[PDB]
């Protein structure tokens, strides 16, 4: 939830009123999750249980209580409606029947924190987690961190990178299950059943006859997305976590995506640390790492980046994607194909010629930027309507229809 944009406060109109938290933010907007910098407090995040009202306002859940006991019924209440009710903290003494046995419990009548006698309390909180955001709810022992470092930790955890092999946190807040499931990175069984066949690329599920229509009983083909460039140039791949023949229910996790460990959220990796000054190598905030952490390859990450070439309608003529680049050396041409494009799966050093374009004959051939070295994993070709489809596009298409044909062949089978 941001405050900038059209009809919104600009960073030059900040002041202090918008950039401070108020007792009305409790359970509606996270108090500790905001970006540190020029726009602090202007951009916030909704709380875990936050809810938009019918008229557009924010609402948070609460439990209605009577004089004697705490009633189970739960009502969503917005900021205006909190004045009459005295709201109790999510933690309070209970007599095993809902009766607050304490003498003075922490409450707030009119946004004024104070103690009150249980006989006058009218509403009770739902969860202590409903105050912080989803990002802030993932910090273990958040109650032992000051709000500055909690803010920094939430914003930091927001910026992690998926490592080669995800490792679930040994100590978490249990909210990792929820954030992993609610995001779409994990392949979730839309209908329960028994897994028919599994491999690194797809999952096929025999849908239970009970949870199926009359005809076409078992059809649920889950195509896992393999290594795919994200918006931040990080890899996005999903791995199966189910074998053949095991029964699955509606909502189970068949494949876990990036930064996930069998349905949990696994951003980083847990490792044995010691808190001691070691020869001044961890001086101000530095970290000193054993060579095992590199040998075990724990924090390595995969970065996918793309490079493009466009065939412009140059004034003299159209430029063609041809391998006969003028004044081209042999080894570089050997790395290339006949159509002028690098074969998929070729190690590329700096300055090598990935794609060959001749523009009238001058060369617009794509080469990798300096300092950039990697392995080619995929090549995509788009051709304008009414233009000749090159051989590589033909091969890519025939592979795609072969895959499609085999998918419906086994689905029919």
């Amino acid at each position: 939830v941001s405050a900038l944009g059209p009809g919104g406060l600009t960073r030059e109109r900040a002041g202090f009123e918008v950039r401070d938290v108020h007792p009305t933010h409790y359970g509606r907007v996270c108090p500790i999750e905001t970006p540190e910098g020029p726009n602090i407090g202007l951009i916030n995040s909704l709380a875990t249980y936050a809810r938009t009202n019918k008229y557009g306002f924010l609402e948070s859940p609460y439990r209605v209580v009577k004089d004697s006991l705490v009633t189970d019924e739960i009502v969503f209440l917005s900021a205006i409606e909190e004045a009459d009710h005295v709201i109790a903290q999510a933690s309070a003494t209970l007599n095993e029947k809902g009766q607050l046995v304490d003498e003075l419990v922490a409450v707030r009548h009119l946004n004024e924190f104070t103690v009150k006698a249980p006989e006058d309390v009218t509403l009770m909180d739902v969860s202590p987690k409903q105050v912080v955001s989803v990002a802030a709810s993932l910090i273990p022992f958040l109650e032992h961190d000051d709000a500055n470092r909690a803010l920094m930790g939430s914003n930091m955890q927001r910026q992690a990178v998926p490592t080669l092999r995800a490792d679930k946190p040994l100590v978490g807040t249990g909210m990792e299950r929820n954030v992993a499931r609610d995001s779409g990175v994990c392949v979730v069984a839309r209908r329960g059943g028994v897994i028919d066949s599994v491999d690194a690329s797809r999952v096929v599920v025999r849908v239970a006859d009970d949870e199926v229509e009359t005809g076409e009983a078992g059809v649920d083909i889950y195509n896992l997305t393999k290594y795919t460039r994200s918006n931040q140039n990080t890899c996005i791949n999903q791995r199966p976590l189910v074998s053949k023949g095991d029964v699955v229910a509606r909502g189970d996790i068949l494949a876990d995506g990036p930064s996930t460990d069998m349905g949990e959220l696994a951003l980083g990796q847990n490792m044995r640390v010691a808190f001691m000054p070691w020869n001044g190598f961890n001086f101000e905030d530095s970290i000193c790492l054993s060579e095992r952490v590199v040998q075990e390859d724990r924090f390595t990450t995969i970065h996918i980046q793309e490079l493009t070439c466009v065939a412009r309608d140059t004034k003299l003529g159209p430029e063609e994607i041809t391998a006969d680049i003028p004044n081209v050396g042999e080894a570089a041409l050997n790395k290339l194909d006949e159509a002028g494009i690098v074969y998929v799966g070729a190690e590329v050093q700096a300055g090598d010629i990935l794609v060959g374009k001749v523009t009238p004959v001058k060369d617009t051939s794509l080469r990798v930027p300096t300092g950039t070295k990697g392995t080619v994993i995929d090549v995509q070709v788009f051709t304008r309507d009414g233009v000749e489809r090159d051989s590589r596009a033909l091969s890519i298409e025939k592979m795609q229809l072969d895959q499609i044909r085999k998918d419906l062949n086994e689905e029919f089978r």
């Binding site: 306002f57 917005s78 900021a79």
Partner: protein, 48 residues
């Protein structure tokens, strides 16, 4: 006038009640209404 005289209290922008949260639907509808009013004016000019 009553607020000036002392009856009642002035509103403060701190309350999340005095603010409201939009979403993709609301401003998407606003942009659609802007385009619709432009098209409507053009049509009224043409279909007169």
């Amino acid at each position: 006038v009553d607020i000036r005289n002392g009856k009642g209290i002035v509103d403060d922008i701190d309350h999340l009640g005095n603010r409201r949260v939009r979403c993709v639907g609301e401003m998407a509808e606003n942009q659609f209404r802007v385009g619709l009013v432009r098209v409507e004016r053009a049509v009224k000019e043409r279909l007169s």
